[PDB]
Amino acid sequence: GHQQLYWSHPRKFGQGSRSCRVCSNRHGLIRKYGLNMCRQCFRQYAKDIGFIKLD
Amino acid sequence: MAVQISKKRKFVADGIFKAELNEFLTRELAEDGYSGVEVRVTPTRTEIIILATRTQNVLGEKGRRIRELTAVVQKRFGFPEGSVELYAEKVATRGLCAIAQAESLRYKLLGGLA
Amino acid sequence: MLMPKKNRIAIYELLFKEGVMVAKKDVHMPKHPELADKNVPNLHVMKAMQSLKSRGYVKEQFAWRHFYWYLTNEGIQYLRDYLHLPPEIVPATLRRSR
Amino acid sequence: AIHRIRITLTSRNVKSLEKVCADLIRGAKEKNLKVKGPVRMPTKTLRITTRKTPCGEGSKTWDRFQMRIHKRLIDLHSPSEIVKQITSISIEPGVEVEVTIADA
Amino acid sequence: TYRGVDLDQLLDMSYEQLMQLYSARQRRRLNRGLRRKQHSLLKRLRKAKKEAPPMEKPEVVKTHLRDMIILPEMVGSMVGVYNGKTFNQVEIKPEMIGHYLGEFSITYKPVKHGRPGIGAT
Amino acid sequence: YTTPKKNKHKRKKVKLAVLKYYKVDENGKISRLRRECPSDECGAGVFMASHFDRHYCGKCCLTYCFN
RNA sequence: AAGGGCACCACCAGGAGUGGAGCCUGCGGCUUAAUUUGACCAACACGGGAAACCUCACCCGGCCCGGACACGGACAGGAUUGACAGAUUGAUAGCUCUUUCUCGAUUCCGUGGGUGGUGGUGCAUGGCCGUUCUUAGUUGGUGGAGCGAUUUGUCUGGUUAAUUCCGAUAACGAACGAGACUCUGGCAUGCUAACUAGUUACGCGACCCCCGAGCGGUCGGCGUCCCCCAACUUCUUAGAGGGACAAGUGGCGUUCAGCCACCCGAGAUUGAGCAAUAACAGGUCUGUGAUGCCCUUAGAUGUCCGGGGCUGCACGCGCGCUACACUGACUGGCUCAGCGUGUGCCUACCCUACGCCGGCAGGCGCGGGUAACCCGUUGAACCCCAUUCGUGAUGGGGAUCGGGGAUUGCAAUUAUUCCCCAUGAACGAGGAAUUCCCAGUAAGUGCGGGUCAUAAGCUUGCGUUGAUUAAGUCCCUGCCCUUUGUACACACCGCC
Ligand SMILES: [Mg+2]
Numbered sequence A: 001g002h003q004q005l006y007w008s009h010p011r012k013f014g015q016g017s018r019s020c021r022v023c024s025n026r027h028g029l030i031r032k033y034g035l036n037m038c039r040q041c042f043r044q045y046a047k048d049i050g051f052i053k054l055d
Numbered sequence B: 001m002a003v004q005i006s007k008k009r010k011f012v013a014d015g016i017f018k019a020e021l022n023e024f025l026t027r028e029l030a031e032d033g034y035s036g037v038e039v040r041v042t043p044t045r046t047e048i049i050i051l052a053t054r055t056q057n058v059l060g061e062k063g064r065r066i067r068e069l070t071a072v073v074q075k076r077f078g079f080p081e082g083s084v085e086l087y088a089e090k091v092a093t094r095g096l097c098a099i100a101q102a103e104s105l106r107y108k109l110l111g112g113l114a
Numbered sequence C: 001m002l003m004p005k006k007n008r009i010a011i012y013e014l015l016f017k018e019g020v021m022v023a024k025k026d027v028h029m030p031k032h033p034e035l036a037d038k039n040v041p042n043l044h045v046m047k048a049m050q051s052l053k054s055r056g057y058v059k060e061q062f063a064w065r066h067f068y069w070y071l072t073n074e075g076i077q078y079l080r081d082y083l084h085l086p087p088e089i090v091p092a093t094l095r096r097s098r
Numbered sequence D: 001a002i003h004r005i006r007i008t009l010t011s012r013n014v015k016s017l018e019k020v021c022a023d024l025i026r027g028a029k030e031k032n033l034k035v036k037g038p039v040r041m042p043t044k045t046l047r048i049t050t051r052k053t054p055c056g057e058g059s060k061t062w063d064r065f066q067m068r069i070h071k072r073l074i075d076l077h078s079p080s081e082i083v084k085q086i087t088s089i090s091i092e093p094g095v096e097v098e099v100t101i102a103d104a
Numbered sequence E: 001t002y003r004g005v006d007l008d009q010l011l012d013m014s015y016e017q018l019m020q021l022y023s024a025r026q027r028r029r030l031n032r033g034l035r036r037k038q039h040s041l042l043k044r045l046r047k048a049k050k051e052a053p054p055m056e057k058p059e060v061v062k063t064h065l066r067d068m069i070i071l072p073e074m075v076g077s078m079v080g081v082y083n084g085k086t087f088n089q090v091e092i093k094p095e096m097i098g099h100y101l102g103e104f105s106i107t108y109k110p111v112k113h114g115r116p117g118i119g120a121t
Numbered sequence F: 001y002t003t004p005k006k007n008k009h010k011r012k013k014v015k016l017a018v019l020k021y022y023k024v025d026e027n028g029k030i031s032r033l034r035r036e037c038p039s040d041e042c043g044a045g046v047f048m049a050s051h052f053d054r055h056y057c058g059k060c061c062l063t064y065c066f067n
Numbered sequence G: 001a002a003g004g005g006c007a008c009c010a011c012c013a014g015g016a017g018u019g020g021a022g023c024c025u026g027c028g029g030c031u032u033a034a035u036u037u038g039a040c041c042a043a044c045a046c047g048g049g050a051a052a053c054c055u056c057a058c059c060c061g062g063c064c065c066g067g068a069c070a071c072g073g074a075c076a077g078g079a080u081u082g083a084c085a086g087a088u089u090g091a092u093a094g095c096u097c098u099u100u101c102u103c104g105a106u107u108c109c110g111u112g113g114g115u116g117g118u119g120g121u122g123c124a125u126g127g128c129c130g131u132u133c134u135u136a137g138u139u140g141g142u143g144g145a146g147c148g149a150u151u152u153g154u155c156u157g158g159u160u161a162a163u164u165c166c167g168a169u170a171a172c173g174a175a176c177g178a179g180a181c182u183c184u185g186g187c188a189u190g191c192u193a194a195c196u197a198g199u200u201a202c203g204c205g206a207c208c209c210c211c212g213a214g215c216g217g218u219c220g221g222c223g224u225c226c227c228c229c230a231a232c233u234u235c236u237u238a239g240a241g242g243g244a245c246a247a248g249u250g251g252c253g254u255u256c257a258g259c260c261a262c263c264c265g266a267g268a269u270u271g272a273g274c275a276a277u278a279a280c281a282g283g284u285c286u287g288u289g290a291u292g293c294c295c296u297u298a299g300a301u302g303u304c305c306g307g308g309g310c311u312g313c314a315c316g317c318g319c320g321c322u323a324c325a326c327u328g329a330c331u332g333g334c335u336c337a338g339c340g341u342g343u344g345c346c347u348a349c350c351c352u353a354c355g356c357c358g359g360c361a362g363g364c365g366c367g368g369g370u371a372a373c374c375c376g377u378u379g380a381a382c383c384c385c386a387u388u389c390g391u392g393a394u395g396g397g398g399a400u401c402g403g404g405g406a407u408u409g410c411a412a413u414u415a416u417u418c419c420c421c422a423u424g425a426a427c428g429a430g431g432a433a434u435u436c437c438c439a440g441u442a443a444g445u446g447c448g449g450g451u452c453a454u455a456a457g458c459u460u461g462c463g464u465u466g467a468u469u470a471a472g473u474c475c476c477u478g479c480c481c482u483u484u485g486u487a488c489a490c491a492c493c494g495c496c
């Protein structure tokens, strides 16, 4: 359809409004500290950001 | 102040920038013997230093490719213009870089070697 | 792609004025961040660059959620004779201060 | 000018912060400014707990991560002006600095 | 009699003072702006009722929006409410005022329990 | 599948010939037989529609209805 | 089968329970157009899976191409695109139709060829992670033996949590794991520093005794980093260090490796993280622009939009919460925490002091806080002290259900949540069975974070109160090492 209904449904909040900043996944997001990264992607890159294991 | 975010979020954003830049350099400089990324940030400007084996290969005709990557990193993260510089550094003892050796092994396997 | 000329030339001259261009993967983005005044949708520029890659005038690199198109040497003369330009004006990456 | 400034340093490791907090104040004493004592703020520990598995099947083992952010406050106070006196920051990568004044 | 006043007074009961006769949820609904879809549906029912023959029920009108709250000016219409599969035509009784349209087109049929299968050993 | 409805017929355009909806007479006299869209975004170059009960502007999308 | 050692995912002695009741939640089954699906110690409050839309992958319907590139037709005398009205549509989808305007080379058609897919395949795979197995075990070289598969090394014994070490020794020399290591808690009146942490002293004050004290008592009242206009770091923070080693004494011990008791000491075993070889057809292609092969790709298994469902109930099961009360409930008063969060690239959405309105849920204006600067000295619960209740399904219990009032959102019905007044159901300690646990431990008790536009019965942590029992054993359930039997080797869930 035209622009009046193609993206008409609001996504200004809710689970569909948020996606992973790496793989654009819509499940298991980590919004803490504005990380905005998927759980799998965070485990993949936590050494790179700097979250290292201590205990 | 209000314009600047908290320190925790700032460190998180720095880590995000580091990881994204590392991924971009990995996917872009894979055939150029990429080793790793080192960034030096100052309030005046930022300095990004790439560790790689073939500096003459990552650098295009009269530094064409290094200019291309500098423009890419200028555009994507929205730095102030002229506040980022890209240095390509030849690594020491490239046999000690697991990234470079793994990429070379992948190159060998893609070549058809057993 | 049904996108018109008036933004096609704008995207083309942005792509020629500097050797590269960066586009986030979001087909529903109301406006591409740079070239702000032209009011060009992001899907149009994404598919224009896809067509240029298909014809081989640009090569594409993909990070997490971004494209990193690199204009090639076959992209020089195509943009030149599409924009009707003499071979003296170069992208910034090609010639600097020389 | 009469200037009284504040210098804050923060990073993720303690060795770099300590060596900066040492050499900077030593340079200040060699450059005869009286220095307000270094204030080590309480550490911000950023904890993230995440299941190790990417699927959910397993023994419910949680992977926990940390990020220790240490910050130090040093105040440089001189009877005369400061900024024209000291300009060199001598800052290694990995540590952040913000230079403010008493008004700021 | 919705709240002690007759239906005739409810027909000319304007929205601003009608919210003091609805419950809290309906009053909050009408306090917020009704979108263009609801207004279009109201115009459609008005058109159907005015074009309806005298002493005879109007024609059926269909809709997916079952979150519409019932207004007194829609009484007597033939409205077909979607249940997820088909449109269910339903009367508007003079007792249905504070109730949403979705309550009268069930989204499931009630279960007829049969012999249990392999489970629950 | 087995869609209960038949496949929806997509519109095919009328394949209009040369426009020619304006005429001059006795060795040249302009005769606008189509309505003018007066807005700036329409301009004075384009003409309006000639519907049996209203006029429509292709660009300005205004509707002048005559009763 | 024997011998030795070991474990609260085993037992003993106990504690708390579960299973008995209600409710929440997840599986199966039933029903459904659809109740998307995986997973069956090592699945069943798991997929960080607390779904109104989105999520969505399921169903009922409607659009768009977001089908590149190439070839050939098509066309500026129009390739083709948008759209007002009416019908039509759930729809103000020009989606279709009547009807004409308008964009202009970007498209259209067909042929190949893309491409995409939460489509399939974890029994094709990468990666991840779980389990074997957190037990202490594992391997190379050289040498010895055996025709060889293999064996010694890698052990009689003693010791340890530990093939941990001592000791013998056809072995020698190694290597990983364990250990070692990092964080954590416990002592540092030792050092450095402190207006974004305090203390002490002093000066203003304010109130009581003022009989009379007066350098009397209290102040989280104001001040002395306002720059000359006090000192100090114990309390707080975080760095550099120290500190504990079976070190000292007695005993046991081949007096070796070590073991028991005790003084001094803060501490004589703080919890974690990492964690070998080999393996599972263990789980994930529904995390990925990780991905092979197959399927679809224009009436779409793409994508968007509307709605419904994922909650649906004769029933079984799992984890939980609430309780069955007087060691209690209610009412009032008094009184102490610690993790840790707080305004955002897309992305709109913060923590909130204080003042006013309302009975409450909430609303109305002034601010603070991007943070040891504000919430906050986080005035928490439990508990403590007083009132009432009185052994009753009772003032325990609040399930079910009626009405009304607010919050968030586009939308609260299949009730989002909250508040008020109504009803007070089972339940009176729970069969056979069964879970977890040795000191700040179980358990009682609240508080942060995750999910959050709105939200916790879940989870991760934090703090408060705070124990009984035990310092053993192999009885069950298992594990390691040695010997032994084997007709097993997909390895006893075997073979026959
Ligand atoms: Mg009572």
Ligand SMILES: [Mg+2]
Pocket (backbone or CB within 6 Å): none
């Ligand atoms: Mg025999």
